[PDB]
Structure 1
Amino acid sequence: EAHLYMQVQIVAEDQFCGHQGNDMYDEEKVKYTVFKVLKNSSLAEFVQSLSQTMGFPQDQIRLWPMQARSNGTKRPAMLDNEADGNKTMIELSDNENPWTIFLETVDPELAASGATLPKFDKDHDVMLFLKMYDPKTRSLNYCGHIYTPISCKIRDLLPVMCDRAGFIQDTSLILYEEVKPNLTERIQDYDVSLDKALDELMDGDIIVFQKDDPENDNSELPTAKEYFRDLYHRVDVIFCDKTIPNDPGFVVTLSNRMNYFQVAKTVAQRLNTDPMLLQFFKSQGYRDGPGNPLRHNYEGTLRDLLQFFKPRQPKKLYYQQLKMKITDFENRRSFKCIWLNSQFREEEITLYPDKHGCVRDLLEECKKAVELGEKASGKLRLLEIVSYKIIGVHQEDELLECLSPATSRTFRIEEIPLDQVDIDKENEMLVTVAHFHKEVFGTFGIPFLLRIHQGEHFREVMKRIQSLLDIQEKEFEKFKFAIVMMGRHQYINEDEYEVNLKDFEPQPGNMSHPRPWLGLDHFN
């Protein structure tokens, strides 16, 4: 019969002291007393059971069912123990569970002296709750509750609030009603009765009061209204570093009504860095992870950044620390290219030079980014390759805006190999080499530049090829060596030793159009 029970959670008035937020208490920051009770048990049985279990007389406690209101608040409500005493709790709660009840008792130090629970007239009495705001410490102090006739005038309650809050008597007080979060309404007329003074008067409403004192204009929150405003927009954001995997991040309390500059300043303070050396990423919203990067000029608030989180979900925000100022970082051009290492292996790299810089600046960035040879030259170069053929070398003075935006154009950066750094210009010649299976169109493999001497024993070139490649010493044999020019190719016998530059240079004074190149045939 588990479906026949319900959890009844009792909260006492001692839990009201110290609460700094809206309404009576924080749902998370509170200790309940939970009761597992049969749905068909009567309420009277429950009032008896609680009074006996917690050690009170049944006529010394009052039950105030915790009832939710339309405005989104949750306040104590009225329950009649006598008239309604024979009805079951499951019908009284209207299908609610857990069921919270405020227990109003007499102060045991004022109850041991003989006082009892005052009577309450539903038509003419009201239960007012009193809070005191202290601007100097910026905090709330719970000042208990009071029974008061609806028709009573505020002026007759002023002495009570004063001596009930520990104020010297006849102290001028500023009164507000905390109607709901972000709604604190000042009471302008103290000479009118409570009915007229308080719109939609219900049991459980709370009037906050503070001293009327000039010192408040030195406080950054002179009144309780501004206090509840700043509290309404306060939110705890968890900042996480995108570089650190699964970084739990640190939590900073900020205001929703905050722009980019203030947030960046705060985070930079809690990180001991210059605000400009940080780039932020909004969360992808449903998944947890870095989303769209934020520009430095973003004209928004924190709510826009946290808007796709549920109020239950943790609101995370990613970031990364920069080595350079955020504006220059936003004006960097993503340049994807291929880096050739000491092992003759291709690596994918992405650099962010200034969009207006030159090739020189790119090479300088790569030098700051990479390591050089053991004792090689230490000078790098930039090749432009199309169809696995080098279609150009870019001089370090070329403009970055002058480079082929086409996807067929591949930019390689490579350390000049030792036997290619300084060669002999009128004897040795660098020839372009590429692979191909069967016909010459389907190229593949890693193309390369090969040195060639003068009148050189073509089988020297084949033992050089074998020395470079280094596969087993048979599979080299199926390479078919050809000379390709404008699509034509003539195959050359390896043991004939036919070599000289003239059959590799184009016609006299010719550069602009394709130079003869070496072609290799085998299958991949």
Structure 2
Amino acid sequence: GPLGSEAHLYMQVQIVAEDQFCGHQGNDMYDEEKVKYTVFKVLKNSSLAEFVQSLSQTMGFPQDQIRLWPMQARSNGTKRPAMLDNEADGNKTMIELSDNENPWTIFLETVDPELAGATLPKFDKDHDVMLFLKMYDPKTRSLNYCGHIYTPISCKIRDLLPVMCDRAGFIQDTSLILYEEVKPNLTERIQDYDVSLDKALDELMDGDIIVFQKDDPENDNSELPTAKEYFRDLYHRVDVIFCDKTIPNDPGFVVTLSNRMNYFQVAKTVAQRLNTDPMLLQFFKSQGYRDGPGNPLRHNYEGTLRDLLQFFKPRQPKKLYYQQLKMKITDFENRRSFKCIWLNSQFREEEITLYPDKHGCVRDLLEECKKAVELGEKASGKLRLLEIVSYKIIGVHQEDELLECLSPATSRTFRIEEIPLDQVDIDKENEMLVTVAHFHKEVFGTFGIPFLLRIHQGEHFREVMKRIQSLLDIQEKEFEKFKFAIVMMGRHQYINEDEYEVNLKDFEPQPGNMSHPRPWLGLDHFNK
């Protein structure tokens, strides 16, 4: 709006009291966006002494009870209180002390208004340093402002250990770990307490910060055992929205994490936020273009959370998608669907998907299906796996074969069935299984449900027909309507059903030839 004629002669002076330092969890003394100031509009060329007496009357403390420490920015990017000499700069101008920083911030040390009172201790500009103290509690992972101290440069670090303990509520003689909080993402441990402050601290200045904590075994029970780790985590912090993909339109919940986290750490933060096993969750990389879940994140991901978020533009809402699982994410990742046909005791087909071990044998699949189905009444209770192509059985698979060695279900159907009673242990000297398929007129025109059939040497074809129809169930002048043939690689010829006696070697391959083209029995009727 309209600036006054003499507005350029004035400057802003923001006074911060030490109560603003209490509760601060970050680096330095306060957050510039949360701090509350007492604001003064003062002439740029008023002197320091004028401001001091003015401020002393404004705040209600005599000049004996207050001291001014300008908040000066350091070369390393921090802002810290700094020394200001009363009877050597008290007549320099406010703006020349300011170094032309127009909103000029100053920390006002006062005596506790609890007294008045004894005045602030004197302070030798040359041999004394004002240090700031923070205590780090690893159990609550928190910072606790512990005030400031006047101390001689020559004082030994060990001599500061009492007051620290005193200000933290620790019992005296508690062993401590001490750090200088140099700057964000740099917390340097003070390794020798038996040396002076000027030797122990990097570039000893007024406004330096010592963070201290107990030396305690229980520290290792926290996610952040040291102040060093705490400040690293804080520097790498980032809020991320998490959304369940299975719940449509979910707004999801904000979780505070750190850019340096690996898969296990973010998984456990989110799992405790959801109260589940971290292993019963699956996460998804971002699609990287528009909001929506991307590719599944393998549980053994080697990257960091920063890699997962690198595609979010500098102010896009960071968001990751997950879903909750019914099994551990490892088993979820290694399960493989095997879809096949279960043929029940009624001779009817159903589609069933089993999830055995991807490295299992055929027996694993057979037992997975046996757990799912109701078997026949007084039946064998043992299952077998058949491979069907174009309505013909081409193979019986033995239980020791590896599953991954089987052709995928891509027009080649697999059929699990219970073995009939007459087929569990056939007479190996005179009894044989042959495959049976339905065809119409010509052999390559197959249809229907093929099956395995036991036949006996010397038997008359009549009884083969009887057991065929017993397992098939169809009107008898419907069953009598059709013919029977023996088939080998396209060639076929019919059995005289009036009087033929079953000779097994009419159905036998060439001796020594276990190849997949075996002779089979064909039923020749009409379809539907």
TM class by smaller structure: 0.5 to 0.7
Query: Cα 1:156–1:296, aligned 2, differ >3 Å: closer, same or farther?
Result: closer
Q: Which moved more, 1:318-327 or 1:471-480?
A: 471-480
Q: Shift in Å at residue 84 of structure 1? A: 2.7
- What runs of 5+ residues in structure 1 fail to find an aligned partner? none
Q: Which moved more, 1:75-84 or 1:258-267?
A: 258-267
Q: Shift in Å at residue 206 of structure 1? A: 1.3
Between the aligned partners of 1:513 and 1:177, the Cα distance in structure 2 is: 80
- What runs of 5+ residues in structure 2 fail to find an aligned partner? 1-5
Question: Which residue number corresponds to residue 456 of structure 1?
Answer: 459
Larger radius of gyration: 2
Q: Shift in Å at residue 478 of structure 1? A: 54
Q: What does the per-residue CA deviation read over 1:293-332, in whole Å, with 9 as the maximum and x for residues that have no partner? A: 7666643111223346688875444567899998999999
Query: Cα 1:248–1:336, aligned 2, differ >3 Å: closer, same or farther?
Result: farther
Query: Cα 1:237–1:472, aligned 2, differ >3 Å: closer, same or farther?
Result: farther
Between the aligned partners of 2:11 and 2:497, the Cα distance in structure 1 is: 94
Query: Cα 1:95–1:442, aligned 2, differ >3 Å: closer, same or farther?
Result: farther
8 Å CA contact retained: 2:395, 2:516: no
Query: Cα 1:141–1:267, aligned 2, differ >3 Å: closer, same or farther?
Result: closer
For the residue of structure 2 that corresponds to 1:494, the secondary structure is coil
Q: Which moved more, 1:306-315 or 1:360-369?
A: 360-369
Q: Shift in Å at residue 146 of structure 1? A: 1.1
Between the aligned partners of 1:341 and 1:23, the Cα distance in structure 2 is: 75
Query: Cα 1:52–1:467, aligned 2, differ >3 Å: closer, same or farther?
Result: farther
Query: Cα 1:337–1:235, aligned 2, differ >3 Å: closer, same or farther?
Result: farther
Between the aligned partners of 1:216 and 1:307, the Cα distance in structure 2 is: 33
8 Å CA contact retained: 2:262, 2:304: yes
Between the aligned partners of 2:404 and 2:482, the Cα distance in structure 1 is: 41
1:21 matches 2:26: yes
- Aligned with residue 35 of structure 1, among 31, 40, 47: 40
Question: Which residue number corresponds to residue 231 of structure 2?
Answer: 228
Q: Shift in Å at residue 194 of structure 1? A: 1.1
Between the aligned partners of 1:523 and 1:81, the Cα distance in structure 2 is: 115
Between the aligned partners of 1:211 and 1:154, the Cα distance in structure 2 is: 15
Between the aligned partners of 1:418 and 1:150, the Cα distance in structure 2 is: 98
Between the aligned partners of 1:43 and 1:467, the Cα distance in structure 2 is: 114
Q: Shift in Å at residue 276 of structure 1? A: 8.1
Map of 1:36-75 to 2, 5 A cutoff?
Answer: 36-75=41-80
Query: Cα 1:407–1:173, aligned 2, differ >3 Å: closer, same or farther?
Result: closer
Q: Shift in Å at residue 150 of structure 1? A: 0.7
Q: Which moved more, 1:354-363 or 1:209-218?
A: 354-363
Q: Shift in Å at residue 500 of structure 1? A: 52
For the residue of structure 2 that corresponds to 1:52, the secondary structure is helix
Q: What does the per-residue CA deviation read over 1:156-177, in whole Å, with 9 as the maximum and x for residues that have no partner? A: 3333434444443344333222
Query: Cα 1:370–1:16, aligned 2, differ >3 Å: closer, same or farther?
Result: farther
8 Å CA contact retained: 2:15, 2:105: yes
Q: What does the per-residue CA deviation read over 1:72-109, in whole Å, with 9 as the maximum and x for residues that have no partner? A: 32211222334333444444333434332111111223
Q: Shift in Å at residue 33 of structure 1? A: 2.6
Q: Shift in Å at residue 195 of structure 1? A: 1.1
For the residue of structure 2 that corresponds to 1:442, the secondary structure is strand
Q: Which moved more, 1:423-432 or 1:130-139?
A: 423-432
For the residue of structure 1 that corresponds to 2:67, the secondary structure is strand
Q: What does the per-residue CA deviation read over 1:463-516, in whole Å, with 9 as the maximum and x for residues that have no partner? A: 999999999999999999999999999999999999999999999999999999
Q: Which moved more, 1:467-476 or 1:347-356?
A: 467-476
Q: Shift in Å at residue 202 of structure 1? A: 1.0
Between the aligned partners of 2:120 and 2:356, the Cα distance in structure 1 is: 79
8 Å CA contact retained: 2:339, 2:409: no
Q: Which moved more, 1:165-174 or 1:419-428?
A: 419-428
Query: Cα 1:225–1:522, aligned 2, differ >3 Å: closer, same or farther?
Result: same
Q: Which moved more, 1:186-195 or 1:160-169?
A: 160-169
8 Å CA contact retained: 2:67, 2:110: yes
Query: Cα 1:400–1:227, aligned 2, differ >3 Å: closer, same or farther?
Result: closer
Q: Which moved more, 1:55-64 or 1:481-490?
A: 481-490
Percent of matched pairs sharing the same residue: 100
Between the aligned partners of 2:351 and 2:74, the Cα distance in structure 1 is: 61
Query: Cα 1:266–1:55, aligned 2, differ >3 Å: closer, same or farther?
Result: same
Between the aligned partners of 1:10 and 1:46, the Cα distance in structure 2 is: 12
Between the aligned partners of 2:348 and 2:38, the Cα distance in structure 1 is: 69
Query: Cα 1:334–1:70, aligned 2, differ >3 Å: closer, same or farther?
Result: farther
For the residue of structure 2 that corresponds to 1:441, the secondary structure is strand
Q: Which moved more, 1:466-475 or 1:269-278?
A: 466-475
Q: Shift in Å at residue 123 of structure 1? A: 1.8
Q: Shift in Å at residue 210 of structure 1? A: 2.6
Between the aligned partners of 1:521 and 1:264, the Cα distance in structure 2 is: 62
CA root-mean-square deviation: 10.1
- Residue correspondences, number: 522
8 Å CA contact retained: 2:436, 2:450: yes
For the residue of structure 2 that corresponds to 1:338, the secondary structure is strand
Q: Which moved more, 1:340-349 or 1:232-241?
A: 340-349
Q: Which moved more, 1:45-54 or 1:59-68?
A: 45-54
Query: Cα 1:475–1:371, aligned 2, differ >3 Å: closer, same or farther?
Result: closer
8 Å CA contact retained: 2:393, 2:437: no
